[PDB]
Amino acid sequence: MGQVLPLVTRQGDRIAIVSGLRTPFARQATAFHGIPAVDLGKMVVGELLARSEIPAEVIEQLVFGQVVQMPEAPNIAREIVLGTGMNVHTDAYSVSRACATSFQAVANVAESLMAGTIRAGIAGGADSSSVLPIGVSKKLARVLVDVNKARTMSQRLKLFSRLRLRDLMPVPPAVAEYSTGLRMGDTAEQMAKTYGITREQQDALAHRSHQRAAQAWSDGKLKEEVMTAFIPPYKQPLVEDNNIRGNSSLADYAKLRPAFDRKHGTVTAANSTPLTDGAAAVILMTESRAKELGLVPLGYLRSYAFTAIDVWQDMLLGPAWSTPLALERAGLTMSDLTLIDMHEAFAAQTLANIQLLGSERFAREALGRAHATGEVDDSKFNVLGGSIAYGHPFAATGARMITQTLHELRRRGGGFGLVTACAAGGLGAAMVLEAE
Amino acid sequence: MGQVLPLVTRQGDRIAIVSGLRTPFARQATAFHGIPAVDLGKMVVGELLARSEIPAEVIEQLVFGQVVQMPEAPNIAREIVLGTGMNVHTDAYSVSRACATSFQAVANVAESLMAGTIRAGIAGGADSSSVLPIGVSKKLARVLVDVNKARTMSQRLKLFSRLRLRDLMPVPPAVAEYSTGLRMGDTAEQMAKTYGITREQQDALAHRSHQRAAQAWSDGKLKEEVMTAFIPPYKQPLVEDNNIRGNSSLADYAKLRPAFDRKHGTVTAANSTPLTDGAAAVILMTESRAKELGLVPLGYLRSYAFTAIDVWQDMLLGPAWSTPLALERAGLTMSDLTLIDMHEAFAAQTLANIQLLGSERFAREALGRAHATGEVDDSKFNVLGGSIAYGHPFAATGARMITQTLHELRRRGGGFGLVTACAAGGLGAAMVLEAE
Amino acid sequence: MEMTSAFTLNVRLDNIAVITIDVPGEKMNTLKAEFASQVRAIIKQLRENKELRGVVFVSAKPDNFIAGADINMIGNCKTAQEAEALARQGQQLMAEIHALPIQVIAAIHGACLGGGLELALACHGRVCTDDPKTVLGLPEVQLGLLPGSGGTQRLPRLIGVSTALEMILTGKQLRAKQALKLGLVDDVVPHSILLEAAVELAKKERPSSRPLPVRERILAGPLGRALLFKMVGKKTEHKTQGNYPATERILEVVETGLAQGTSSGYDAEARAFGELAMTPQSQALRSIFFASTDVKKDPGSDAPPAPLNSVGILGGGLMGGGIAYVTACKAGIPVRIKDINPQGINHALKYSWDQLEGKVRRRHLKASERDKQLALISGTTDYRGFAHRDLIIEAVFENLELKQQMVAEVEQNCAAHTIFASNTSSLPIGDIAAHATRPEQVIGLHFFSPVEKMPLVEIIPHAGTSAQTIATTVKLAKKQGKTPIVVRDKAGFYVNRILAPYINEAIRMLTQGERVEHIDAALVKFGFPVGPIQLLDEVGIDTGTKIIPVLEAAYGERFSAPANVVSSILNDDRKGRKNGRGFYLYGQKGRKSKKQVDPAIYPLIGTQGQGRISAPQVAERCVMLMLNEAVRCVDEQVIRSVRDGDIGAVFGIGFPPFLGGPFRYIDSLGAGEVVAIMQRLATQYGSRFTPCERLVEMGARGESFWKTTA
Numbered sequence A, B: 001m002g003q004v005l006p007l008v009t010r011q012g013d014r015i016a017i018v019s020g021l022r023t024p025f026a027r028q029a030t031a032f033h034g035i036p037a038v039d040l041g042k043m044v045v046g047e048l049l050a051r052s053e054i055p056a057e058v059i060e061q062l063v064f065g066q067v068v069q070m071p072e073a074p075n076i077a078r079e080i081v082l083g084t085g086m087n088v089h090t091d092a093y094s095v096s097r098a099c100a101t102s103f104q105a106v107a108n109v110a111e112s113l114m115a116g117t118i119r120a121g122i123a124g125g126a127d128s129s130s131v132l133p134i135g136v137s138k139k140l141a142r143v144l145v146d147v148n149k150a151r152t153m154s155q156r157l158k159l160f161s162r163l164r165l166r167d168l169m170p171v172p173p174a175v176a177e178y179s180t181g182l183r184m185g186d187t188a189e190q191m192a193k194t195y196g197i198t199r200e201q202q203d204a205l206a207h208r209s210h211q212r213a214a215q216a217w218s219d220g221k222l223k224e225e226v227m228t229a230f231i232p233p234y235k236q237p238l239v240e241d242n243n244i245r246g247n248s249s250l251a252d253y254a255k256l257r258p259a260f261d262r263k264h265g266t267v268t269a270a271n272s273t274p275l276t277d278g279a280a281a282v283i284l285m286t287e288s289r290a291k292e293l294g295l296v297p298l299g300y301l302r303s304y305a306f307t308a309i310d311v312w313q314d315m316l317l318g319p320a321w322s323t324p325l326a327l328e329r330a331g332l333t334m335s336d337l338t339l340i341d342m343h344e345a346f347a348a349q350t351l352a353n354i355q356l357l358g359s360e361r362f363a364r365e366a367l368g369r370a371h372a373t374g375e376v377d378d379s380k381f382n383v384l385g386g387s388i389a390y391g392h393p394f395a396a397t398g399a400r401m402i403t404q405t406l407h408e409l410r411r412r413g414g415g416f417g418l419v420t421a422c423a424a425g426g427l428g429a430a431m432v433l434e435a436e
Numbered sequence C: 001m002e003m004t005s006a007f008t009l010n011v012r013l014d015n016i017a018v019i020t021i022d023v024p025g026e027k028m029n030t031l032k033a034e035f036a037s038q039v040r041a042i043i044k045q046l047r048e049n050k051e052l053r054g055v056v057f058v059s060a061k062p063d064n065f066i067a068g069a070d071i072n073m074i075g076n077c078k079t080a081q082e083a084e085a086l087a088r089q090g091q092q093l094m095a096e097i098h099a100l101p102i103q104v105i106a107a108i109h110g111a112c113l114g115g116g117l118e119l120a121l122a123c124h125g126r127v128c129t130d131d132p133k134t135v136l137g138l139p140e141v142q143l144g145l146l147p148g149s150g151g152t153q154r155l156p157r158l159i160g161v162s163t164a165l166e167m168i169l170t171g172k173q174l175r176a177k178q179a180l181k182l183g184l185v186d187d188v189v190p191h192s193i194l195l196e197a198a199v200e201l202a203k204k205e206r207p208s209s210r211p212l213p214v215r216e217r218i219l220a221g222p223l224g225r226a227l228l229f230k231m232v233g234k235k236t237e238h239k240t241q242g243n244y245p246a247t248e249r250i251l252e253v254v255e256t257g258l259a260q261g262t263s264s265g266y267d268a269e270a271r272a273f274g275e276l277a278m279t280p281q282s283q284a285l286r287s288i289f290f291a292s293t294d295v296k297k298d299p300g301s302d303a304p305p306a307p308l309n310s311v312g313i314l315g316g317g318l319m320g321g322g323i324a325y326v327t328a329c330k331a332g333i334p335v336r337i338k339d340i341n342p343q344g345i346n347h348a349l350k351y352s353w354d355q356l357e358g359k360v361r362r363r364h365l366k367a368s369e370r371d372k373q374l375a376l377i378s379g380t381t382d383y384r385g386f387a388h389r390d391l392i393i394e395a396v397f398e399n400l401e402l403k404q405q406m407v408a409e410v411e412q413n414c415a416a417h418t419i420f421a422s423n424t425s426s427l428p429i430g431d432i433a434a435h436a437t438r439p440e441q442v443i444g445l446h447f448f449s450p451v452e453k454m455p456l457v458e459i460i461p462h463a464g465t466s467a468q469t470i471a472t473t474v475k476l477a478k479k480q481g482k483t484p485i486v487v488r489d490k491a492g493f494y495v496n497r498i499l500a501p502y503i504n505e506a507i508r509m510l511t512q513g514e515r516v517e518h519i520d521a522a523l524v525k526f527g528f529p530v531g532p533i534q535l536l537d538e539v540g541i542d543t544g545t546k547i548i549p550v551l552e553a554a555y556g557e558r559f560s561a562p563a564n565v566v567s568s569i570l571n572d573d574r575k576g577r578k579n580g581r582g583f584y585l586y587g588q589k590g591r592k593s594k595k596q597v598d599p600a601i602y603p604l605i606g607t608q609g610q611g612r613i614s615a616p617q618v619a620e621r622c623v624m625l626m627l628n629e630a631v632r633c634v635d636e637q638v639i640r641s642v643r644d645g646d647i648g649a650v651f652g653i654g655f656p657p658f659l660g661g662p663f664r665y666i667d668s669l670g671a672g673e674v675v676a677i678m679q680r681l682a683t684q685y686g687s688r689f690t691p692c693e694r695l696v697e698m699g700a701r702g703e704s705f706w707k708t709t710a
Helices: A037-052 A076-083 A101-114 A138-149 A153-159 A184-196 A199-219 A250-254 A287-292 A318-330 A347-357 A360-366 A396-411 B037-049 B076-083 B101-114 B139-149 B153-162 B186-194 B205-210 B214-219 B287-292 B318-330 B350-357 B360-365 B397-412 C033-048 C071-075 C080-098 C116-122 C154-159 C161-170 C176-182 C191-202 C225-240 C248-260 C262-276 C280-297 C319-330 C342-355 C367-375 C400-412 C429-433 C467-479 C495-510 C516-525 C532-539 C541-545 C548-554 C566-570 C615-636 C642-650 C662-668 C673-684 C693-701
Strands: A015-027 A062-065 A121-127 A276-286 A300-308 A339-342 A417-423 A427-433 B015-022 B061-064 B091-094 B120-127 B278-286 B300-305 B416-423 B427-434 C007-011 C016-021 C054-058 C103-108 C125-129 C187-189 C311-314 C335-338 C377-380 C391-394 C419-423 C442-445 C456-461 C483-486
Touching: A015 A037, A015 A101, A015 A287, A015 A396, A037 A076, A037 A121, A037 A276, A062 A076, A062 A101, A101 A121, A101 A276, A101 A300, A101 A396, A101 A427, A101 B101, A121 A396, A138 A153, A184 A347, A184 C191, A199 A250, A199 A347, A276 A287, A276 A396, A300 A318, A318 A347, A318 A360, A318 A417, A318 A427, A339 A396, A347 A417, A396 A417, A396 A427, B015 B037, B015 B101, B015 B287, B015 B397, B037 B076, B037 B120, B037 B278, B061 B076, B061 B101, B076 B091, B101 B120, B101 B278, B101 B300, B101 B397, B101 B427, B120 B397, B139 B153, B278 B287, B278 B397, B300 B318, B318 B350, B318 B416, B318 B427, B397 B416, B397 B427, C007 C033, C016 C191, C033 C080, C054 C191, C071 C280, C080 C116, C080 C262, C103 C116, C103 C191, C116 C154, C125 C176, C125 C191, C154 C161, C154 C248, C154 C262, C161 C225, C161 C248, C176 C187, C187 C191, C225 C248, C248 C262, C280 C483, C280 C642, C280 C662, C311 C319, C319 C335, C319 C342, C319 C377, C335 C342, C342 C377, C367 C377, C391 C400, C400 C419, C400 C429, C419 C429, C419 C467, C429 C442, C442 C467, C456 C467, C467 C483, C483 C642, C495 C532, C495 C548, C495 C615, C495 C642, C516 C532, C516 C615, C532 C541, C541 C566, C615 C642, C615 C662, C615 C673, C615 C693, C642 C662, C673 C693
Parallel strands: A062 A121, A339 A417, B061 B091, B061 B120, C016 C054, C054 C103, C103 C125, C125 C187, C311 C335, C311 C391, C335 C377, C391 C419, C419 C442, C456 C483
Antiparallel strands: A015 A276, A015 A300, A121 A276, A300 A427, A417 A427, B015 B278, B015 B300, B120 B278, B300 B427, B416 B427, C007 C016, C442 C456
């Protein structure tokens, strides 16, 4: 039967997206230094309520997922309300799903007001690479575990005898998988070597993404969904992202040594997302209540999909797998897709995706579909640049694209927007956006 | 249908529930000492799948959660699939909600299973009170960050010049709230004091909770819900819970010092449940999926409700607030409700709930409802005893009650069950059960 | 196409040549006489073009790169000429290859054994995949041979004198990870980029300009090589007992290659093939190799088998846990354990823990996969959850009614698809079934002393047993690394039946005043591992003897041991290693050295007389009873095939592999000639040495049990 999932509530009201906002991104060891990710979420949601002029007590649930969490604050969502002017009776909780925490936050909040258990939701995310919850070595942790249970003072001295000068150094942060140990750069390289990705076209994507984003900022199109962050020192405000290098050349890109595979790697810092900190917040209202309170829905929500893949090889094929499922649930096709957006974690993995999305062989056997998904037109492909530009703040990546996509389809006809993003652990996310 | 909501899916199938399982509960030192919470969830899921005709590949999403968490492997659900024999293509996801993490996991499973993305799931939780992660002093948290970011050796020596005083002793755990600081037993005393409950009015609910459970074990009625624990040391297995003390007389533990007040502490240790370790797991799937594979569901699911209150006084009235919401959402009443199940985490407070659920004043002003929900019969209240017996694992007492309730109403051959639990932060839960 | 052979040359746009080895016939990549000549034509064509810069060898086969020399090819040799001539042509083949000035690179993937490393050592550089199937070694000594050429002289010069010697002798397996550490392979690369990673290595300017140094250069030269050879030669001769050839030969041929040059090792190893390729031991090891491979390829039954995915075992303790560990840890099949006592499950699950995680202490693996192995072993006290068990194992006491009670109830308490397997000691399988509503799928296995050392099991069906049940049961042993033999359902079976006279005769000759130490050493020098008494106690005196009355009541009194002296051991708490006291001192208080037996058994033994019987006589008398029972047992076709009879005995009891097997020994020793020498023993000692009926038949007229080709 037709596996179509039109996102309308029990009353038949479809799910809308009334507005959205994003905190500007900045590099690590910059203005965004020493700031816990809890503060970013509190700051962004405080202004958005004022900007959206909607009362705080109306909203009935908040979900905020963050990477690089702080163990002191396990549930960030509760402390956001405790820190901001959100109503105490908020029924909020936090999630965590790779870099697609926002997409997961979008997924469960949208289905939350689907069931009628609540009536309003706001989604977002925040992460910061400036501060690290660096921990002690596990054995050193175990040494302190046993001494706490010790009752005799003389027993304490004998129990700390198990010590070494190698134990005192802390554990620096890393990104390698728990059960695999492969970095994303190692992943991005293996598609480049296997499928075949030349650095010239890979760095071309980075240049084009940089220029398209740089052109977008100069035009000021992505100015209404980017606020001006304030720092508690209040030395200078940041209005525009410092990550984008709008004055760059392809010859400048070609003189970068490979970082991950210094022998045959075809990815560099030019064609890879750097470490940025930021946040975003988006309000999700069903259409029945959006008209009730007198707000225009900044688009709507049509369908969504998530598909999982293997963790040992081809971990970044989530957009290849998740995208076909969303279109069938939305009952749509790439042909009638005005704008397409996808996460450009690496240039090598990006060009592979369109290559694999254009690969009939991959769809017929790996996906089992009768035909391939479709073609990705470069004109509609990442018009305002992509992830190789603003940055990859982990949680805010999912929310950032939706605002710009809805804003861009607002600048154009109705159409059908689409966002896809790969994730660690063989995870992928995809959905189709309406925007009238 | 202004208040009643059916729990049927899009396809016309009600949210069925299949038989569930529960790990036996043991004290923190007699058994389960030194084991992490990672294996507890792994232990139950390994055998629960290898107990019925269902394979491991049918399930598409797992939702777990632990109230006590370990900083390593924050997403406990992922390693459960990784640790045990489970499909590597499952949607791993974990939640966190004190004293109702399983309850929230069940609701999260239920809400997502209706959207059609997932048609079958497993819900549960793991709790361990013997490997409590002891955190370092917060002063010895910036220093470790500062020393790691330090460049030269001379800078390292200067930073630790600040290291002195009582920073070397660790931080033992406590139950006082982050923003309220109530020990959850100090505030339980004032509910007993304000609502006027005496130590002899209580201490019989605890006695009748110790009873009807020792009788339950001797009768072997709850033999299907309890596994026989295997210990990796392999010294001896545990089949019967050691926490229960259904042999002492009511006048034997009445001569005990109060735990919290020690001056007007009408509650003591004997009539209050002690901390234990355990886990539970239940099989959840839609009606369409359940019948097409040939397995009888352990009853069904009717409705659910959660209500929150400000955490400053009498905050365990979640069952007082949440329960009437469940009845109106299921369109039911206490009169036509066979068997109930209260959390009864302490002597009184739960008795105050019967006092409050039987009080019209609380419903008319604190709830705005025209009428109170009505009183409950003692025989229809905790037939198999209560939490004052087996123990109170914070993340495992959720799924425990449903399995016994559906099984008990199965012995009763019908009726509608009801389970509620109070939680920290002024949080509560309420569900309406139906064993066909 | 029968003319392309396997070596096909291919040159890319760059000045390199890629070589594929695709055998048109069998999947495994072997070497024949025609490959040696055609590759010389290929390399001659490669020599004429001066534009090239390097060559890379590609497996072009998902199974293996090159398996090695074909064993039948050695089998066609008749005199020392062919072995040396094949050796002679082998030397020039790689020397021509090694004479090339440009870089030669080999990409290793799949398998590489015997003649496989011949090409690898003939190439300047080699690259191997990290796929866990690739391996390097020289499995020539186990075949009664040695590496074809160069292996005894160039490899020690390339990998080290100490390192190379043991691999040739021990014939161990070298993995990809430790190959790079030792230095044989320059780099380890993923299989996806195996060929591409070999591209840049061929482009290297230096074929060999800076060889790696030797950290063990201390003994390099003549100062310690002779001392090493003297010690290991003494070490080898003691471990090999002196009854195995090609053991001191390796030391000699390694010595001549290392001392006075490589060409000297060429002739000595060529000379070694002159005798070692044509040796009764060499044919014995080549014959058992073909026999062992035949039974593995043999599927036991003819009907297609039945699905088997869930395994149940009725009994824990120690023996029950043995099957579960092999079924779960090795075969990767979940196993459920049921017992009436949790301590039985406790012991089995603990015993699995104790035997496992020892490699963890040796860092051979990590705990990440250990938990999964434990996840496949489950214990329970109830029949619940057994409804999905495809096969069930009976591992409890051999009471017939108890077996009948459980087989009836497990038939009652399980689905019809589940088949029955029984580890009976002496009870008949059909008698065990008896009142079975489903007898057609009831089969009997027979395990032994802990099966992680015992390398085979028994397939023992009764009268009513569907060929599907045999097919499942025979194929059950294969994935367990066991040799399945289908045997006739008779009292005492086949392996257990023949060992009864062996332990009977040992006890009979023990009581007549003979010292155990000298007679035991004489029997183990014959080629038998483990002596009679030490083998008898550790396996279970009660278990082993429990079949003897069944042997006695079935065939005759030849199985009966001298009474009132063997039974005295049973009711004296002297029950071997399991009971903590028996025969040998088991405390091992002599610095864990060779302890002498307990100086208290002799007073309990009659031990009247002296040694009397010569050392060669006691050893042969032990094998006569084995052969006398073997000729009698398979006379009534207790074994499906003669080869199964051979592999049942030579691989399960410990018959000297250099002798080949039971009837390998018979044919070797003049066939009917041995028939004469047993009759005189019958007149000397008793009627127990009477010749078998068909043994007389073959002896009187002159016959060999194996026509085959001669």
